[PDB]
Copies of this chain bind each other. A is one copy, B any other.
Amino acid sequence: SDWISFSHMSSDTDHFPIKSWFRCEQKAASRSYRTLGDMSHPQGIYEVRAAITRLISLTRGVKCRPEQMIIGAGTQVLMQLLTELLPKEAVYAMEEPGYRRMYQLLKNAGKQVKTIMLDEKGMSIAEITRQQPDVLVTTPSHQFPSGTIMPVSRRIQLLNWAAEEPRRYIIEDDYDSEFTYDVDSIPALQSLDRFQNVIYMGTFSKSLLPGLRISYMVLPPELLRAYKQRGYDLQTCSSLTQLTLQEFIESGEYQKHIKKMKQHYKEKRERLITALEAEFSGEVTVKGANAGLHFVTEFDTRRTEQDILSHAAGLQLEIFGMSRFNLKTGRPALIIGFARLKEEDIQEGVQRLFKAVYGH
C-alpha cells in the first residue's frame, strides 16, 4: 500500500504520543486498580467528567457543572440517547450538506428531519424559520463538510430563535474545534446562550485517535433531569479508558499534544494550499480552510465526480466527494483532509490529484 490519504475521516498516528497515552494508562491503572472491578457511574466517572469540564471551559468557554455531562462511546450513541431525552414529537433540523449518518439515524427513528441549506454564514436561519423545526443540529465552529465558520451574528440569530419559543433546542456538535488557524477562537454557542437551549457535544476522535471511542455531551438541567429519571443506563466507555483520559488531561499531556499539533497542522495546510495553487495554477477553488483539518476544493472538468473518484482510487489517492454529504450534480467538489496526509507526500499527492482531475 503506497497510498496517499487526502481523507478527512483519518488521523495521523505518527504524531499522536502513543507511548505517553500508554504511560497515562499505566499510571491510572496503578492508581485505581481496586475500583476497576466496579462499573462506572452511568454518566461517567465523576472526576473524569470534572477534568473534561475544566478543559472545555478553558479552551472553548463552555459553562457547565460536571453533573450535566454524559460520556460517551462516540457521538452516535450520545445522539441516540439524546433523541430519547428530547420530546418524542420534536422535528429535527440538520445542515445541508452535512452528516448523512445522523440523518439516517434520525429518519430511522421515525423522526421528521428537515434539511437546512447553508449560506456564507452557516446553516440558513431563514430556512429554519420557514420550515419551523424544534431541534437544530449544527456545526458552528467548522461546518461539516463545507468548512464555513458560523459568525457570531448567525449564532446570535440561532439562539434568538431557540429562545423565542418553548422546547426548542440547539445541538452544537463541536467537532474539529481544537484547531483554529489564522482565525482566532470564537466561543461556543453554548457559552453565548443565556437560556440553556443548547446541548453542547464534543469528541476526542480528532484530538486523539478515532479508535479510542470517547465523546461527551452537556445537557440542559431539564434534559439532565429526564436522563436521571431513566434509571437503567450503563456507561459505554471503559473505566480505564476514562481514567487514562483523565490522567492524559490532568498531566498536561493533552495541552502539550494540542499545541504542537496546531502548529503542525497550520504549516501543513499552508504547504498543501501552495502545492494546490502551483499544480492547478488557480483552476481550483478552495473553500472553508480557516480552521479544522479539512477544506473543500472545487475543480472544473468534463469528468463526473464519480469517475474522478474511481480514477483517484486507481492512483492510490484516498479522497472523497462532496456528493457523499447530501442528506436529502453541477461541478466537481472534493473534500481534502490533511490529518493523515504525510508531509513528504504533498507534491506527489497533489500530482495524483491533477492526473485524477484531468488525466495528465
Chain A 17-57 residues near chain B, CB threshold 8 A: 18, 22, 25-26, 29, 33-40
**Contact (A37, B18) CB under 8 Å given A77-B236, A239-B211:** no
Q: How far is the CB of A211 from chain B (nearest CB, A)?
A: 3
**Residue A108 at the B interface, CB < 8 A?**
yes
Flag if A104 contacts B230 (CB, 8 Å): yes
Segment of A5-13, A117-125, A191-199, A287-295 in the binding face: A5-13
Flag if A234 contacts B22 (CB, 8 Å): no
Q: Which residues of B contact A108 (CB under 8 A)?
A: 84, 230, 232
Q: Which residues of B contact A100 (CB under 8 A)?
A: 232
Interface size on A, residues (CB 8 A): 50
Binary contact track A217-236/B, C-beta < 8 Å → 1, others 0: 00000000000001111111
Flag if B40 contacts A13 (CB, 8 Å): no
Instruction: For A230, give the chain B residue with the smallest CB separation.
Output: B108
**Residue A101 at the B interface, CB < 8 A?**
yes
* Residue among A25, A76, A240 facing the most chain B CB atoms (10 A cut-off): A240
Binary contact track A193-216/B, C-beta < 8 Å → 1, others 0: 000000000000000011111000
**Residue A238 at the B interface, CB < 8 A?**
yes
**Residue A140 at the B interface, CB < 8 A?**
no
Instruction: For A77, give the chain B residue with the smallest CB separation.
Output: B236
**Contact (A212, B238) CB under 8 Å given A10-B38, A33-B18, A340-B37:** yes
Flag if B11 contacts A37 (CB, 8 Å): yes
Q: Which residues of B contact A212 (CB under 8 A)?
A: 238-240
CA distance in complex: A277, B335 (Å):
72
Q: How far is the CB of A80 from chain B (nearest CB, A)?
A: 8
Instruction: For A81, give the chain B residue with the smallest CB separation.
Output: B80
Flag if B18 contacts A22 (CB, 8 Å): no
Q: Which residues of B contact A105 (CB under 8 A)?
A: 232
Q: Which residues of B contact A350 (CB under 8 A)?
A: none
Flag if B33 contacts A210 (CB, 8 Å): no
CA distance in complex: A122, B73 (Å):
35
Flag if B39 contacts A13 (CB, 8 Å): no
**Residue A353 at the B interface, CB < 8 A?**
no
**Contact (A29, B39) CB under 8 Å given A76-B233, A212-B238:** no
Interface residues of A (CB under 8 A from B): 9-13, 16, 18, 22, 25-26, 29, 33-40, 73-74, 76-77, 80, 84, 100-102, 104-105, 108, 209-213, 230-241, 339-340
Q: Can you list 10 A-B contacts with CB-CB less than 8 angstroms, sorted by A residue number?
A: A18-B29, A18-B36, A22-B25, A22-B26, A73-B213, A73-B238, A76-B233, A80-B80, A211-B238, A212-B240
